[PDB]
Design an enzyme around this catalytic site. Structure first.
Site, PDB file in Angstrom:
ATOM      1  CG  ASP A  41      -2.137   1.040   1.260  1.00  0.00           C
ATOM      2  OD1 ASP A  41      -1.796   1.793   0.255  1.00  0.00           O
ATOM      3  OD2 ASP A  41      -2.913   1.135   1.959  1.00  0.00           O
ATOM      4  CE  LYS A  79      -2.490  10.103  26.349  1.00  0.00           C
ATOM      5  NZ  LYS A  79      -3.417   9.447  25.601  1.00  0.00           N
ATOM      6  CB  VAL A 197      -8.604 -10.044  -0.765  1.00  0.00           C
ATOM      7  CG1 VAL A 197     -10.030 -10.761  -1.211  1.00  0.00           C
ATOM      8  CG2 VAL A 197      -8.042 -10.815   0.448  1.00  0.00           C
ATOM      9  CB  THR A 359     -10.263   5.030  21.621  1.00  0.00           C
ATOM     10  OG1 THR A 359     -10.753   5.780  20.454  1.00  0.00           O
ATOM     11  CG2 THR A 359     -10.572   5.826  23.230  1.00  0.00           C
ATOM     12  CB  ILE A 361      -3.591   1.226  19.723  1.00  0.00           C
ATOM     13  CG1 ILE A 361      -2.902   1.347  18.533  1.00  0.00           C
ATOM     14  CG2 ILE A 361      -2.800  -0.033  20.590  1.00  0.00           C
ATOM     15  CD1 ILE A 361      -1.297   1.988  18.538  1.00  0.00           C
ATOM     16  CD  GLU A 456      -6.825  -2.159  33.621  1.00  0.00           C
ATOM     17  OE1 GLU A 456      -6.617  -2.474  32.158  1.00  0.00           O
ATOM     18  OE2 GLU A 456      -5.796  -2.355  34.287  1.00  0.00           O
TER      19      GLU A 456
HETATM   20  C1  LIG Z   1      -5.146   7.894   8.982  1.00  0.00           C
HETATM   21  C2  LIG Z   1      -5.444   7.163  10.405  1.00  0.00           C
HETATM   22  C3  LIG Z   1      -4.631   7.985  11.318  1.00  0.00           C
HETATM   23  C4  LIG Z   1      -5.270   7.625  12.807  1.00  0.00           C
HETATM   24  N1  LIG Z   1      -4.378   8.449  13.829  1.00  0.00           N
HETATM   25  C5  LIG Z   1      -4.816   8.014  15.105  1.00  0.00           C
HETATM   26  C6  LIG Z   1      -4.113   8.689  16.369  1.00  0.00           C
HETATM   27  O1  LIG Z   1      -3.406   9.669  16.155  1.00  0.00           O
HETATM   28  N2  LIG Z   1      -4.239   8.305  17.704  1.00  0.00           N
HETATM   29  C7  LIG Z   1      -5.239   7.133  18.069  1.00  0.00           C
HETATM   30  O2  LIG Z   1      -5.102   6.785  19.163  1.00  0.00           O
HETATM   31  N3  LIG Z   1      -5.687   6.415  16.977  1.00  0.00           N
HETATM   32  C8  LIG Z   1      -5.571   7.066  15.380  1.00  0.00           C
HETATM   33  N4  LIG Z   1      -6.055   6.188  14.408  1.00  0.00           N
HETATM   34  C9  LIG Z   1      -6.865   5.037  14.836  1.00  0.00           C
HETATM   35  C10 LIG Z   1      -6.130   3.847  14.992  1.00  0.00           C
HETATM   36  O3  LIG Z   1      -5.166   3.812  15.302  1.00  0.00           O
HETATM   37  C11 LIG Z   1      -6.361   2.643  13.880  1.00  0.00           C
HETATM   38  O4  LIG Z   1      -7.615   2.559  13.484  1.00  0.00           O
HETATM   39  C12 LIG Z   1      -5.894   1.438  14.403  1.00  0.00           C
HETATM   40  O5  LIG Z   1      -4.567   1.465  14.682  1.00  0.00           O
HETATM   41  C13 LIG Z   1      -6.267   0.312  13.445  1.00  0.00           C
HETATM   42  O6  LIG Z   1      -6.100   0.544  12.080  1.00  0.00           O
HETATM   43  P1  LIG Z   1      -6.156  -0.535  11.124  1.00  0.00           P
HETATM   44  O7  LIG Z   1      -4.621  -1.234  11.027  1.00  0.00           O
HETATM   45  O8  LIG Z   1      -7.101  -1.439  11.229  1.00  0.00           O
HETATM   46  O9  LIG Z   1      -6.318   0.313   9.739  1.00  0.00           O
HETATM   47  P2  LIG Z   1      -5.242   0.378   8.449  1.00  0.00           P
HETATM   48  O10 LIG Z   1      -4.143   0.930   8.948  1.00  0.00           O
HETATM   49  O11 LIG Z   1      -5.925   1.320   7.183  1.00  0.00           O
HETATM   50  O12 LIG Z   1      -4.989  -1.100   7.652  1.00  0.00           O
HETATM   51  C14 LIG Z   1      -5.102  -1.206   6.203  1.00  0.00           C
HETATM   52  C15 LIG Z   1      -4.517  -2.761   5.831  1.00  0.00           C
HETATM   53  O13 LIG Z   1      -5.495  -3.566   5.320  1.00  0.00           O
HETATM   54  C16 LIG Z   1      -4.737  -4.373   4.323  1.00  0.00           C
HETATM   55  N5  LIG Z   1      -5.437  -4.658   3.121  1.00  0.00           N
HETATM   56  C17 LIG Z   1      -6.250  -3.511   2.752  1.00  0.00           C
HETATM   57  N6  LIG Z   1      -6.787  -4.395   1.577  1.00  0.00           N
HETATM   58  C18 LIG Z   1      -6.477  -5.523   1.085  1.00  0.00           C
HETATM   59  C19 LIG Z   1      -6.387  -6.381   0.279  1.00  0.00           C
HETATM   60  N7  LIG Z   1      -7.094  -6.300  -0.837  1.00  0.00           N
HETATM   61  N8  LIG Z   1      -5.830  -7.258   0.143  1.00  0.00           N
HETATM   62  C20 LIG Z   1      -4.944  -7.816   1.305  1.00  0.00           C
HETATM   63  N9  LIG Z   1      -4.816  -6.536   2.448  1.00  0.00           N
HETATM   64  C21 LIG Z   1      -5.488  -5.562   2.313  1.00  0.00           C
HETATM   65  C22 LIG Z   1      -3.578  -4.125   4.159  1.00  0.00           C
HETATM   66  O14 LIG Z   1      -2.289  -4.859   4.516  1.00  0.00           O
HETATM   67  C23 LIG Z   1      -3.415  -2.649   4.893  1.00  0.00           C
HETATM   68  O15 LIG Z   1      -2.243  -2.484   5.452  1.00  0.00           O
HETATM   69  C24 LIG Z   1      -6.056   6.546  13.011  1.00  0.00           C
HETATM   70  C25 LIG Z   1      -6.650   5.689  12.139  1.00  0.00           C
HETATM   71  C26 LIG Z   1      -6.202   6.397  10.543  1.00  0.00           C
HETATM   72  C27 LIG Z   1      -6.887   5.365   9.633  1.00  0.00           C
END
Ligand SMILES: Cc1cc2nc3c(=O)[nH]c(=O)nc-3n(C[C@H](O)[C@H](O)[C@H](O)COP(=O)(O)OP(=O)(O)OC[C@H]3O[C@@H](n4cnc5c(N)ncnc54)[C@H](O)[C@@H]3O)c2cc1C
Ligand SMILES: Cc1cc2nc3c(=O)[nH]c(=O)nc-3n(C[C@H](O)[C@H](O)[C@H](O)COP(=O)(O)OP(=O)(O)OC[C@H]3O[C@@H](n4cnc5c(N)ncnc54)[C@H](O)[C@@H]3O)c2cc1C
EC number: 1.14.19.9
Lengths: 523, 521
Positions: A41, A79, A197, A359, A361, A456
């Protein structure tokens, strides 16, 4: 059929996927085969994550990973609180606190414990004295030692390692995802496959049979964990589960963020997250080592992306035309159900809310805790799925309610954004909490004032957090708790309790190292 | 302003518990008067209690356990022993034979040990389902059944506490003790008079109570402790009482006190709940006597049938035994607290004493009243937040008690068959679904005094397993987690062995409860 789960497929390889691989790898270890599919990505800047203390006790401890092992590897800082700046005063988005009544417009939501006094929280005694004019001190400075030492950028541990207050972490999520990916693949036997996928195959009961990737490989499993982020390839696109938009409670849906270098030798490191009120949203500041992440969370209904880019860059004196920026459009809300059939969403595929109370993580490992607590076998007893979906839906909606109250109870009326926030409705459950709070009651008081994730989890937004945010903003009860007029021994002796707080403020202010010196010694 | 005057109507156990608790909690800041009329006193049929009677009530009063125990001739309770709930037959005090053993099981106060974050019950059922054991749940997972079978004391003769315990006593004696305490040390005014007329103001709140001698009492807060009559909450304030016989068929009792030779038989350190043809009979051992009562359903047995079944079981003469015959109201008020009137005790709610909740409901409610204590403006959030705490306290116990009958295997009388045709409440039916799916129900946060924790977790995973597995309802299959925790399931052998050691060591070194009781006098 029946029997135990033999195979799990995690789809998605960011922070959530690799948290899911590591937590499930450890919890089931030796009894299930786990594969994670992640596609390449477009990489983003490290804009920073702020966390909660039970990241260590509920997640890394469970993995067997001591705080120092992952800290050094992820260039993490400490923090002690979130500091809320300019939430009560009109004006442009600036990094400097305006003046309120002889002081800076800030208040702290700290991790410290609220002391009880004769089975009643110190918050109630503070307001009793403030209501009757026996004090003008703000709630957070009156009832916690942390505000005084956070004002002086103190370290939460002494240089001999002694911890003097509860703390969480600031870090770049990308580094923790890499640390856990190495941990899960190299020490728990999680299979990493780099593939995208292309098609999800469902059976006639609506469960997922297999996922076919773009290279034609077919992965089958008993349990599918959707960690694909906002796209929700399994839970939303394959399983067709609806997403509940919750824009009637949360107007913020966007962010522009970057990373700024920082001379820690010249200015030290702040031991807190800053949430800086803006004209159409708010800006986070997450100090790390030699840099800080920062992002303007804003509402597309009240500011265009260019307006948000300009307000955010001007505030930090950066060039709107050349600063490297992440521009993000969030999905705000949650799925109708987090777990459907044989597909469990973990992370932002499940639910997302702006990071006003750190929230992101927490939601991941809390849900993972709930998944193992409700772990199915191949018969997929529906009570397990229903009892998990109930926990996830309460974890999120409570957080949604708490965060809405940060904006709903702000006094600001200077921009269309702050005025609009007061025209939304609070959810019934939130409004009842406000009714109680106004009636002098504690809200979700901790059973004790003394590690146990189940306690908690249920009291994650407790009486200390509600007082910190509500009284911080200036919403206070209608009158003192009626139970205090019948406890003159308690209200006379509590002077000693506040005095103990002031002593700790002055003693810790006098003996603590700067967070910078302690960080420097940890290397 | 603040509440200045409180009038408690009713001077039984509830009234004097209310006087002592409020007198202590408010001391020096309110004037409390208790109004009590002369009434025909009843036999002391006995009360069974919970361990936090000491930590939530007497400790709050400042009264150490030995002061009130000795003065009220109380005995020690380690468990409820459930007899003949799985076997057909007449009401007999002796366990019939089931599967190579007596038909009984224990719901003890002991803590269920955790093993790798999981309650010992889940490992027990896993091994029992996979045929690796045939031991009943309570003997496999608790030390208490073995020493209770031998009427052991819960404290050694030097006082060492070996297990959690509560108390058996005659409530009239504790009520006398508390009347002396409240009047002599807390300044509560006692008036012996009969309420004749209650005056309400235009908002429907109580203005004053007028007695038969013409005295008039007013107050800011009125506490109704008038029992099943509900003179304030039901008659004066017109709050409806919600009958809940669609969950609980039992509505009557015939009870007495029976003398007992402790020197020849010792003292049982448990309450017995003895299944009958149309109900069940309690046995509450005290010093030199035990209270006993046949709790039965008027729709399935006449008072005469119940008197006979009860008298024959204890080999008593129906024509000369002193008997209390009562028909109670089963359920709760729509709201416990309305306007300026708070119901405490059986004016508020009542359920058969199958799990010894009667006195618990009183001090649990008094705790909640002080926690939600009003001033003269009577903030409605306080009243609503109290009423909600009482109604879940009650409905939860109601559901738990119904499950004792609903999941009994017996089909031998119309009563046992009728219980299976009632509906469980939706919340209980969810709890059963979780249990069948191998989940814990309301697991204790820890496995180590704090009433707020005790109040919300009052029917926890140990109590549900003790009763449901006691009766023979077990999960559909073992907890799916255990198939993924082979280290935990292999080391749990040691956990069961430690229980068996504790069983044999205490069985051999503990005094009889009788012997400890005699040293306490
Ligand atoms: C831009 C952004 C900024 C954030 N900033 C904060 C913050 O500052 N403080 C806080 O507390 N929380 C923050 N959050 C929220 C929290 O940190 C995240 O939501 C949490 O870490 C979970 O993110 P995620 O990995 O599930 O989503 P993502 O990081 O978007 O994971 C996407 C993953 O999905 C996989 N994927 C997608 N499509 C496919 C496909 N076709 N095939 C195979 N694999 C695929 C890929 O491997 C990709 O890496 C933020 C969230 C986002 C999106
Ligand atoms: C027969 C019976 C058996 C029980 N057995 C058990 C058991 O085995 N185990 C268990 O755990 N719980 C048991 N309980 C429940 C538990 O004991 C009760 O919570 C408590 O003991 C009695 O509650 P009470 O004082 O409100 O009722 P009561 O004692 O009946 O209250 C009556 C009081 O109200 C006064 N009063 C009434 N009307 C007037 C009036 N007009 N004017 C002035 N005064 C008035 C009377 O003078 C009297 O003092 C039993 C309850 C009953 C009624």
């Amino acid at each position: 059929m029946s029997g135990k789960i033999d195979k799990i497929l995690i789809v998605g390889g960011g922070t959530a996927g690799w948290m899911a691989a590591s937590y499930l790898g450890k919890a089931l270890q030796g009894t299930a085969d786990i594969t994670l599919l992640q596609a390449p990505d477009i990489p983003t800047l490290g804009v920073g994550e702020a966390t909660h203390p039970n990241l260590q006790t509920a997640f890394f401890d469970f993995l067997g990973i001591p705080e120092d092992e992952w800290m050094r590897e992820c260039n993490a800082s400490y923090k002690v609180a979130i500091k809320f700046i300019n939430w009560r005063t009109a004006g442009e988005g600036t990094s400097e606190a305006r003046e309120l009544d002889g002081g800076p417009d800030h208040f702290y939501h700290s991790f410290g414990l609220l002391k009880y006094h004769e089975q009643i929280p110190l918050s109630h005694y503070w307001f009793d004295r403030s209501y009757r004019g026996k004090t003008v001190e703000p709630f957070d400075y009156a009832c916690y030692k942390e505000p005084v030492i956070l004002d002086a950028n103190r370290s939460p541990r002494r240089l001999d390692g002694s911890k003097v207050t509860n703390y969480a972490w600031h870090f770049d999520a990308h580094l923790v995802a890499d640390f856990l990916r190495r941990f899960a693949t190299e020490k728990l036997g999680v299979r990493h496959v780099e593939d995208r996928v292309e098609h999800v195959q469902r059976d006639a009961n609506g469960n997922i049979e297999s996922v076919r990737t773009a290279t034609g490989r077919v992965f089958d499993a008993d349990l599918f964990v959707d960690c694909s982020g906002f796209r929700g390839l399994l839970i939303n696109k394959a399983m067709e589960e609806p997403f509940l938009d919750m824009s009637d409670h949360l107007l913020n849906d966007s962010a522009v963020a970057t990373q700024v270098p920082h001379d820690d030798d010249a200015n030290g490191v702040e031991p807190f997250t800053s949430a800086i009120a803006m004209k159409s949203g708010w800006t986070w500041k997450i100090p790390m080592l030699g840099r800080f992440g920062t992002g303007y969370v804003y509402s597309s209904r009240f500011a265009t992306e260019d307006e948000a880019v300009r307000e955010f860059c001007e505030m930090w004196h950066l060039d709107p035309e050349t600063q490297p920026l992440n521009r993000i459009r969030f999905r705000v809300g949650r799925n109708r159900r987090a777990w459907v059939g044989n597909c469990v969403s973990i992370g932002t595929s499940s639910c997302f809310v702006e990071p006003l109370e750190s929230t992101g993580i927490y939601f991941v490992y809390a849900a993972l805790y709930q998944l193992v607590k409700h772990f199915p076998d191949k018969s997929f007893n529906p009570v397990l799925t229903a009892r998990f979906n109930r926990e996830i839906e309460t974890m999120f909606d409570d957080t949604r309610d708490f965060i809405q109250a940060h904006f709903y109870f702000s006094p600001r009326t200077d921009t269309p954004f702050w005025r609009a926030n007061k025209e939304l409705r609070l959810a019934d459950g939130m409004q009842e909490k406000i009714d109680m709070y106004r009636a002098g009651m504690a809200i979700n008081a901790p059973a004790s004032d003394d590690g146990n994730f189940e306690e908690e989890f249920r009291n994650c937004w407790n009486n200390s957090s509600y007082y910190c945010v509500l009284a911080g903003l200036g919403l206070v009860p209608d009158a003192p708790s009626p139970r205090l007029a019948h406890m003159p021994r308690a209200t006379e002796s509590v002077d000693e309790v506040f005095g103990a707080v002031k002593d700790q403020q002055r003693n810790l202010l006098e003996t603590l190292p700067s967070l910078h010196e302690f960080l420097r010694q940890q290397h």
